[PDB]
Ligand binder design. Structure first.
Ligand SMILES: [Zn+2]
Ligand SMILES: [Zn+2]
Lengths: 149, 50, 400, 127, 107, 237, 99, 764
RNA sequence: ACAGAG
DNA sequence: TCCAGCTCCACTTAA
DNA sequence: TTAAGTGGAGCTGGATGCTCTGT
């Protein structure tokens, strides 16, 4: 687990020093830079991710778990803890993704889709309970909060 | 709302009291801030900020 | 890696081919042999081979708790009956062993008495596992419980009771035992050898490696119910035994619309009759511009519907044959609007051509493979009779 | 404990000791022969159909390779699972209908396994 | 330790006899007198760790430093990025900022 | 805010769900405890070892069964070097007193303390659905007795702060017994809290449980970037 | 949303209709940007598809350049004429007398 | 020195799609059904006999299906096209005719063509009228050449039997319980009986649970009932390590507390726990012989080969309690796909046994009672039991089969004809097993085991996100194989029998087990020679090329999977850092000398399974090849499916955008086929002036999308204009909509029937 | 009962 | 698929 | 010796997001 934290340290320095190197050489009257400075749509993570480097593809707060025996895909060696074998993309969305990097980024995207889909039945029953328990309370004219009874 | 094939509902109130409880209490000019933390919700959006 | 040591001869004996068994004990380690314990009864059934033994354990040793032995002997036996009895004395004296049958066929196992420099095999008639029995506790519970108190098509083969009644009909065969320390165990041990010369050439085992491989891996189907006449594109690289060779040219030329001459020798190999076969090949392919071209009758007989979408069209093979004739006289088909002269669709002509050629700008199509030599094979006369026959084909075209 | 191999098996029984040893070897399902006038079909040929006499030779090659040349084809000999329980090789003879002799010939220690060399059988005529 | 009867191969139990303690079978007369010291050592795993943690270097072995937070602008920082909610088409970040030990944690 | 969001802790929707369900057992309970002498870690490991559950097998270097011609027993040799390094208040006489607590009903006459490290446990007849060969039961059950600390605390840990002007050592305890962790010698019991509102209600009263509900809902809402005015969670509590 | 693929589809289409090709957009491959940037300069357009654009309301030129090209839009089955709905008072259920 | 690249490698994909993949899956299952399995069902039910009055019997000999016909008013029959069955609202079926041999006193009376029912014939199968025709002969059948088929026509609607995803039967699953305890289970499914057995460690001792036993009995009593009585042999079979024996000890100590020491005692104990449906001994012995672990065979009550198997289960529970290596339900080596043939086999077997039972009941009524004249059962062969069963179970979609306890619902769906991709995208759908029981988040995720088998991007959005899935472009599903030569080869490669050994060899560090679909073939030393020799015998052609072999080095087992319904994918064999496929081979493929099976036989292309690509190393491209590579990927764009194959440059987008395109692309207005004017459907959307895409994927060329497209090329300026385009709204051109852009057509339907009543009156 | 849409 | 009430059963104190 | 009050274990019954749009 010490190795995991150091690899995530060395890999996430690459995204910062790659993203702070593209934002220094963008001219003004760039359109994503204008749309990110005025906060209307986007950010600096998105510009630095579709120009410089798509970062570590993380699933459940960690690197990509092994789907096969002791490796993520058959395309890598067993027990390899390299960046490319556990979900570090090096390309941007400009230069396009390789097959393994595309598959890992799709793995990281389906978690967002499934959390959005599960979120709905996850929360609505809670709000139904809160409303059924709290709907009676009122602020009276004598500055107190009383129930119906 | 996001204008990507979005359906919204409508209700015409059928009583004068149902009008006046909807205008004074439920109008957009009287609901600019959210009741959660007092922050404004009706404000500018993309291409009105840019 | 030459056989640096021990070119060891391997023999075979048959004098014990139907007497030799193999008793193995799953619960007893290799150190604690039964060589010392005396034996009492040896029982067997020869068909449905099942062995029961009885071994006599002592009592004067310190490892026999006589207080428990008296109680277990009182439990199994009666108190004073002794007419028929499991144990003879007032103690547990014997231990009975029961067998279980390992396999159905022992045809492939062999015991090997390795002498110096040679090795003697002998087949096994059976392989039996002997385990210690616990039937005396069941007999003790039996003595303890007796002291206290137009039919349908049936399945009797798959019942335990009918199976036991099938096994009860065989009478027992009692046997004398002879231990390992007997001289008979040394006397009968020499029958695992065979009387034979050091060098004998074997009459059997003459089969070849490919026959042995075909014998241990037999072909799935001895003959198939339908016969493949091969209109479907079966494996051209597989020299199918039941297909004639000429039909493998017919299906190949239907696949490979044009091919070089030398590939026939490269695909068949020089063992074919590569001189007489041209009276077969002349009926299915004809040589044009140094190469073979498929004949018309292989692709479409005169009732075939259009093979493409758009406006349907009828087959007209001389509308193909005139095109391949034009490649025989000219360098190529070289002009823009041959589809008006021959009246048929452009979608026919430009699709037919697309299986033999590639387009260059304005000047039609390019012949896909270089001008090899016609005169590689010895035949002089065909060089002129080909012109006679294509003159006949031209005269056929001249009717329409 | 380490796991011995067939060349170390036959060396200790030959060079180290003159004393004979009973082995227990398995064969392939068919032996590469014709059943000699056995009224057949190309069925299985086993040891129950052959005759007495020399059946083949055993070649221990350099670097541990052990083959069983059993005619024109050479089989392959490998040490099987090593048993460590008791095994006894007995002769049961039914000299009479109701009685007979039982005799123990010795203890069997090692188990050998024979198998056809499918790579060499297949490299004669590839498919 | 498991010890098994040479006769029938059931499991032995320890009991006491008139001269010694004995291993005895439950189903046959076999007994084995314990004449001398016999032992079986387990050797279990000791509690190897002491595990002090929470050091500041154990906190800041993450990439980010010298960036800008919208609250206190300090360089010594600890960032985080998420994307695992595709209802949020915008990105997701969270930041920690601890140069002056101010300790903000916002979006 | 539940639609926006979802030592390990649970945050997001399951944390708010565990708060408002007010169940008696939450997933991952955490007791945060303050120390009075928060200067150096030599004092912190003492009170760490006073509350964390330590098994007998974790300090014994071997546990052997000895069969003799006159008696059979089970011998446990303590590894006193590890007792020295873990800074624990255990020896042979304390292990003798930690045994005879809910184990097979052994008698105090059955357990001896022959050295300072060796402890022999002579067994007797269980006499209730067991054979006197119950030595095998204590062969695998006696290493799981507790000798020191609180039986409900799974683990405890030392956590140090971030400030440059100071360095104080708190004590994040993963357990479900607030009353015990408050009451040990060396833990500042006036400033220690919990996450489980049921323990805070049972120990410190209904008003402290109200304060705990307020603090915990506001903490879970802050950690996912949300922001609720405190009057709403005040009304909920 | 980071659809750089649409931004390359536009450029590949504009470079494809000016010389009569179909540039491939195959997964993990396809025609690169460095090749379609050379087909647009050769036909007189800018090498990044941005064009000098005059506003049609005022007649003055726009300051920024605008990115023109053919993009393959597909029409979906969701039309508003099949979804506009209203009810003053109408038929009701029989069990619960509500609409 | 750079590794040379074969540039025409992609050609292996258009040569593959002529034969396998892309609804050829459904067709190769339905042809398999109507060619062999309807003969295996008749063989299992070949003779029926009335219980009263013997010496009378009906005997089936052969069964056929034949060509589709329609029965009309004046008993005129005629062959029919599928479009005529689309219009007139009838079903599209061919009559099942069986030949019989029955007794009317004269003991041998035979028949040859006795029609007993009507089988719905799937389109483009081996008995449809459409197969093997030219495109200009699809014209007189009013049928599109590009219609994929694979669907039925039942009462006019087009229903598709979807691909069902199951768990692999007959396999030990070692899993953690809700309580944290580690147990085992195997759903022992055979043809006649399905049942789940368990292995629970609820008190530190091992129990075994079953639906026939009212209380889960300890495991040593089961071993004593199964013929092994010494406890030493039980501990030999479980394991001879120290900690294994220490973990297993309290189950021997439990069995010695009771007085069970003999097999008769154990059978007496187990017999008095049986839920009652000779009692004590025999109802326990038969229960252990045919219900607990029913896929393991006992022949003559020799329980050795079942004792070895339950010892393997107990050893895996013990060794999984040490380190938490529990098996996952999500690795697709443990999934099996069930096509239309394997469902219609079960349906027809149930309907056919109900047919024989109804006829036997009629014969039992009419023989003892009525008349001395010898009746025939030919006069009671009412066809409407088979036809109504098949039509109702296809048209409605519920599969209530009492014989197999299957109660699936929602199997068939209506084939969607919104566009062309919608019709082709439905024919590759895989429904899941759970089907939205709860928000699982375990199978809804994307496992890495779906590499190249299932599409990473194509999935619905919403409650079915990650549960409805779609096949890749280059995948294949095996059928059930023969099992002839596999056992005969395996018993020559040094596999020792399991009967010639005690259990102690299972704890040796050099002895692996060889399984075959859940049954034990024995043990082996030096497993790598076995695996290499088996793969060479597969590459030569002696073993069928869909038989995969694998190795699990942790559990020390060598699996051989010959079963059907599991995923395959082709690859290129790489030997000593060079591929087996050369440029000369691909030129010979392009010129027509060879086809794809010629690549199969010459050991150039082999199929890999999901369990076998666990053991191999695969390079994506040729420049990734190092010394430990065994296979080369043919085409990496085959990773994406069919609906994702429309996306131009899909590897530059963010990943949810491709999913939203896989959803929206099915709903695009377009064209259906060449018969879209002769076709009368419920709701058909067309576009007036469609155009083919200007930027296209090779998948578009493969599925022939641009012969009938969906969409128009719009000249798009990307700018901020007029402020009505804020959140995803887009401004159009008024003078472009007038000239024809976006012009669609909407076709609807209105049908009316005019029936004749039983009373002689009629609508008018 | 199934598929969609937000 | 997860979780509060209800009921059954051993386990000490106390006479 | 046993009457009795209270722990712990198994069984039982309850619940699991909002709408339209079609077959
Ligand atoms: Zn014994
Ligand atoms: Zn801050």
């Amino acid at each position: 687990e010490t190795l995991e934290a150091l690899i995530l340290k060395e890999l996430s320095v690459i995204r910062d020093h790659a993203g702070s190197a593209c934002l220094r050489e963008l001219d003004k009257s760039n359109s994503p830079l204008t749309m990110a400075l005025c906060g209307s749509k986007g950010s600096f993570i998105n510009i630095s991710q579709m120009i410089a480097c798509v970062g570590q593809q993380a699933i459940s707060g960690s690197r990509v778990p092994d789907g096969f025996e002791n490796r993520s895909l058959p395309h890598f060696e067993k027990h390899s803890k390299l960046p490319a074998a556990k979900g570090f993309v090096a390309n941007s969305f400009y230069s396009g993704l390789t097959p393994t990097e595309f598959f890992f980024h799709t793995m990281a995207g389906r978690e967002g889709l499934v959390d959005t889909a599960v979120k709905t039945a996850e929360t609505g029953y809670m709000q139904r309970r809160l409303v059924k328990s709290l709907e009676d309370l009122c602020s009276q004219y004598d500055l107190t909060v009383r129930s119906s009874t | 709302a996001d204008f990507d094939g979005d359906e919204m509902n409508l209700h015409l109130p059928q009583t004068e009291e149902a009008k006046a409880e909807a205008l004074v209490l439920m109008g957009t000019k009287a609901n600019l801030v959210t009741p959660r933390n007092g922050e404004p919700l009706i404000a500018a959006i993309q291409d009105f900020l840019t | 890696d030459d056989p640096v040591v021990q070119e060891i001869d391997v023999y075979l004996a048959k004098s014990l081919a139907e007497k030799l068994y193999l008793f193995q004990y799953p619960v007893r380690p290799a150190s604690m042999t039964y060589d010392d314990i005396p034996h009492l009864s040896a029982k067997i059934k020869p068909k449905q081979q099942k062995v029961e033994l009885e071994m006599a354990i002592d009592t004067l040793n310190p490892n026999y708790c006589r207080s428990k032995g008296e109680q277990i002997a009182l439990n199994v036996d009666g108190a004073c009956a002794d007419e028929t009895s499991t144990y003879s004395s007032k103690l547990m004296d014997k231990q009975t062993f029961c067998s279980s049958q390992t396999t159905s066929n022992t045809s492939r196992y062999a015991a090997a008495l390795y002498r110096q420099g040679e090795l003697h095999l002998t087949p096994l008639h059976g392989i039996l596992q002997l385990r210690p029995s616990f039937s005396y506790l069941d007999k003790a519970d039996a003595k303890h419980r007796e002291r206290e108190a137009e039919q349908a098509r049936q399945r009797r083969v798959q019942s335990y009771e009918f199976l036991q009644k099938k096994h009860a009909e065989e009478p027992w065969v009692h046997l004398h035992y002879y231990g390992l320390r007997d001289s008979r165990s040394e006397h009968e041990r020499q029958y695992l050898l065979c009387p034979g010369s050091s060098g004998v050439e074997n009459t059997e085992l003459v089969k070849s490696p490919s026959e042995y491989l075909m014998m241990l891996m037999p072909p799935s189907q001895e003959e198939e119910k339908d016969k493949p006449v091969a209109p479907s594109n079966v494996l051209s690289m597989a020299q199918l035994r039941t297909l004639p060779l000429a039909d493998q040219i017919k299906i190949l030329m239907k696949n490979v619309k044009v091919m070089p001459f030398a590939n026939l020798m490269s695909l068949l190999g020089p063992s074919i009759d590569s001189v007489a076969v041209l009276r077969g090949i002349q009926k299915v392919a004809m040589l044009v511009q140094g190469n073979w071209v498929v004949k018309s009758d292989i692709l479409y007989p005169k009732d075939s519907s259009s093979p493409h979408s758009g406006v349907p069209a009828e087959v007209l093979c001389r509308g193909r044959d005139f095109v391949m004739w034009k490649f025989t006289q000219s360098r190529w088909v070289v002009r823009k609007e041959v589809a008006t002269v021959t009246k048929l669709c452009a979608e026919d002509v430009k699709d037919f051509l697309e299986h033999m050629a590639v387009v260059r700008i304005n000047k039609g199509w390019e012949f896909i493979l270089p001008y090899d030599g016609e005169f590689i094979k010895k035949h002089p006369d065909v060089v002129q009779r080909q012109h006679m026959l294509w003159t006949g084909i031209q005269a056929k075209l001249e009717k329409v | 404990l380490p796991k011995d191999v067939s060349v170390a098996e036959l060396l200790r029984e030959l060079s180290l000791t003159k004393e004979e040893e009973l082995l227990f070897l398995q064969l392939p399902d068919t032996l590469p022969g014709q059943p000699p006038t056995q009224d057949i079909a190309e069925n299985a040929c086993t040891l129950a159909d052959l005759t007495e006499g020399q059946v083949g030779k055993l070649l221990i090659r350099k670097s541990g390779r052990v083959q069983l040349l059993l005619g024109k084809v050479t089989l392959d000999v490998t040490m099987g699972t090593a048993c460590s329980f008791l095994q006894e090789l007995v002769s049961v003879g039914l000299g009479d209908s109701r009685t007979g002799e039982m005799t123990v010939l010795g203890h069997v220690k090692h188990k050998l396994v024979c198998s056809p060399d499918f790579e060499s059988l297949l490299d004669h005529k590839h498919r | 330790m498991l010890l098994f009867c040479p006769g029938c191969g059931n499991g032995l139990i320890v009991e006491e006899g008139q001269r010694c303690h004995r291993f005895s079978c439950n189903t046959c007369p076999y007994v084995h007198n314990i004449t001398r010291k016999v032992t079986n050592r387990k050797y279990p795993k000791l509690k190897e760790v002491d595990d002090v943690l929470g050091g500041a270097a154990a906190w800041e072995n993450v990439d980010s430093t010298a960036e800008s937070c919208p609250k206190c602008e300090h360089p010594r920082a600890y960032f985080m990025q998420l994307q695992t909610r595709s209802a949020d088409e915008p990105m997701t970040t969270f930041y920690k900022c601890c140069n002056a030990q101010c300790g903000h944690r916002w979006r | 805010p539940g639609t926006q969001m979802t030592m390990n802790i649970t945050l997001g929707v399951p944390r708010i769900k565990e708060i408002i369900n007010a169940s008696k057992a939450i997933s991952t309970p955490i007791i945060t405890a303050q120390l009075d002498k928060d200067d150096d870690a030599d004092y912190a490991r003492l009170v760490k070892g006073r509350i964390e559950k330590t098994l007998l097998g974790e300090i014994s270097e071997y546990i052997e069964e000895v069969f003799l011609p006159d008696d059979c027993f089970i011998l446990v040799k303590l590894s006193l070097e590890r007792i020295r390094l873990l800074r624990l208040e255990v020896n042979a006489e304390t292990v003798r007193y930690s045994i005879c607590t809910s184990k097979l009903r052994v008698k105090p006459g059955d357990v001896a303390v022959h050295g300072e490290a060796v402890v022999c446990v002579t067994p007797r007849e269980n006499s209730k659905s067991s054979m006197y060969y119950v030595l095998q039961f204590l062969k695998e059950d006696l290493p799981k007795v507790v000798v020191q600390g609180i039986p409900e605390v799974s683990r405890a840990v030392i956590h140090i702060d971030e400030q440059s002007g100071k360095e104080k050592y708190k004590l994040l305890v993963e357990g479900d017994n607030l009353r015990a962790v408050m009451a040990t010698h060396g833990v500042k019991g006036t400033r220690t809290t919990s996450n489980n509102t049921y323990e805070v209600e049972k120990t410190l009263g209904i008003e402290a449980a109200r304060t705990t509900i307020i603090n915990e809902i506001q903490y879970t809402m802050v950690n996912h970037g949300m922001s609720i005015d405190r009057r709403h969670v005040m009304l909920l509590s | 949303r980071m659809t750089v693929g649409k931004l390359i589809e536009l450029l590949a289409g504009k470079a494809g209709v000016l010389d009569g090709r179909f540039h491939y957009g195959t997964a993990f491959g396809g025609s690169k940007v460095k090749d379609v940037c050379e087909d647009l300069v050769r036909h007189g357009y800018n090498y990044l598809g941005k064009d000098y654009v005059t506003s049609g309301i005022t007649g003055e030129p726009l300051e920024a350049y605008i990115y023109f090209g053919p993009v393959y839009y597909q029409k979906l089955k969701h039309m508003v004429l099949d979804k506009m709905h209203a009810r003053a008072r109408g038929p009701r259920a029989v069990l619960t007398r509500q609409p | 020195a750079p590794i040379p690249t074969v540039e025409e490698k992609w050609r292996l994909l258009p040569a593959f799609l002529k034969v396998k993949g892309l609804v050829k899956q459904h067709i190769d299952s339905f042809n398999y059904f109507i060619n062999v399995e309807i003969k295996k069902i008749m063989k299992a039910n070949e003779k029926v006999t009335s219980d009263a009055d013997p010496m009378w019997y009906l005997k089936y000999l052969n069964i056929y299906v034949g060509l589709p016909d329609v029965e009309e008013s004046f008993n005129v029959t005629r062959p029919v096209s599928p479009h005529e069955c689309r219009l007139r609202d009838m079903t599209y079926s061919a009559p099942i005719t069986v030949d019989i041999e029955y007794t009317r006193g004269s003991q041998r009376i035979i028949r040859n063509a006795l029609p007993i029912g009507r089988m719905p014939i799937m389109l483009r199968s081996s008995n449809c009228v459409l197969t093997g025709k030219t495109p200009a002969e699809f014209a007189k059948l009013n049928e599109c050449p590009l219609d994929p088929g694979g669907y039925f026509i039942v009462k006019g609607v087009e229903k598709v039997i979807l691909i069902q995803e199951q768990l692999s039967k007959n396999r030990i699953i070692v899993e953690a319980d809700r309580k944290g305890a580690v147990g085992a289970s195997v759903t022992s499914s055979t043809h006649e009986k399905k049942s789940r057995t368990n292995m629970a460690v609820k008190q530190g001792r091992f129990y075994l649970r079953h639906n026939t036993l009212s209380e889960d009995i300890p495991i040593v009593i089961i071993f004593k009932a199964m013929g092994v009585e010494s406890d030493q042999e039980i501990v030999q079979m479980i394991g001879t390590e120290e900690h294994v024996m220490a973990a297993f000890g309290p189950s021997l100590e439990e069995c010695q507390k009771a007085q069970i020491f003999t097999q008769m005692q154990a059978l007496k104990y187990i017999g008095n726990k049986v839920r009652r449906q000779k009692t004590k001994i025999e109802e326990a012995r038969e229960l252990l012989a045919s219900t607990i672990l029913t896929h393991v065979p006992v022949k003559e009550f020799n329980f050795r080969a079942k004792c070895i198997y339950t010892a393997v289960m107990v050893r895996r529970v013990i060794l999984a309690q040490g380190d938490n290596k529990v098996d996952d339900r999500d690795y697709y080596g443990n999934k099996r796909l069930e096509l239309a043939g394997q469902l219609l086999s079960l349906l027809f077997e149930d309907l056919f046994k109900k047919f024989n039972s109804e006829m036997k009941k009629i014969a039992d009524q009419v023989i003892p009672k009525q008349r001395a004249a010898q009746f025939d059962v030919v006069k009671h062969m009412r066809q409407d039991q088979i036809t109504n069963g098949m039509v109702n179970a296809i048209s409605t979609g519920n599969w209530s089969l009492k014989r197999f306890k299957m109660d699936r619902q929602g199997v068939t769906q209506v084939l969607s004809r919104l566009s062309y991709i919608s019709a082709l995208g439905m024919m590759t759908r895989i429904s899941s097993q759970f089907e939205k029981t709860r928000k699982v988040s375990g199978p809804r995720s994307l496992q890495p085991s779906q590499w190249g088998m299932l599409c990473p991007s194509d999935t619905p959005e919403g409650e079915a996100c990650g549960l409805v899935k779609n096949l890749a472009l280059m995948t294949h599903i095996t059928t059930d194989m023969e099992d002839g030569p596999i056992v005969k080869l395996a018993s020559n490669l040094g596999v020792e029998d399991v009967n010639l050994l005690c259990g102690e060899e299972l704890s040796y560090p050099n002895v692996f087990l060889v399984f075959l679909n859940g049954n034990i073939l024995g043990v082996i030393r030096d497993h790598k020679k076995l695996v290499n020799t088996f793969r060479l015998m597969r590459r030569a052609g002696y073993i069928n090329e869909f038989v995969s072999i694998s190795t699990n080095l942790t559990d020390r087992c060598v699996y051989i999977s010959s079963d059907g319904g599991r995923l395959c994918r082709p690859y290129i064999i790489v030997k000593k850092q060079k591929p087996a496929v050369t440029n000369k081979h691909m030129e010979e493929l392009a010129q027509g000398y060879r086809n794809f099976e010629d690549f199969l036989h010459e050991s150039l292309v082999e199929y890999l399974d999901v369990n076998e690509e666990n053991d191999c190393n695969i390079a994506l491209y040729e420049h990734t090849i190092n010394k430990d590579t065994t296979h080369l990927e043919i085409e990496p764009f085959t990773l994406l499916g069919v609906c994702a194959g429309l996306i131009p440059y899909p590897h530059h987008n963010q990943s949810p955008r491709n999913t939203y395109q896989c959803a929206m692309g099915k709903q695009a207005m377009g064209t259906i086929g060449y018969n879209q004017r002769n076709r009368i459907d419920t709701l058909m959307y067309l576009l007036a002036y469609p155009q083919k895409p200007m930027v296209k994927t090779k998948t578009i060329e493969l599925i022939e999308f641009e012969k009938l497209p969906a969409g128009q090329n719009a000249t798009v300026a990307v700018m901020s204009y007029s402020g009505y385009d804020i959140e995803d709204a887009l401004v159009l051109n008024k003078a472009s909509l007038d000239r024809g852009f976006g012009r669609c057509l909407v076709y609807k339907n209105a049908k009316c029937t005019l029936k004749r009543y039983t009373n002689q009156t009629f609508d008018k």
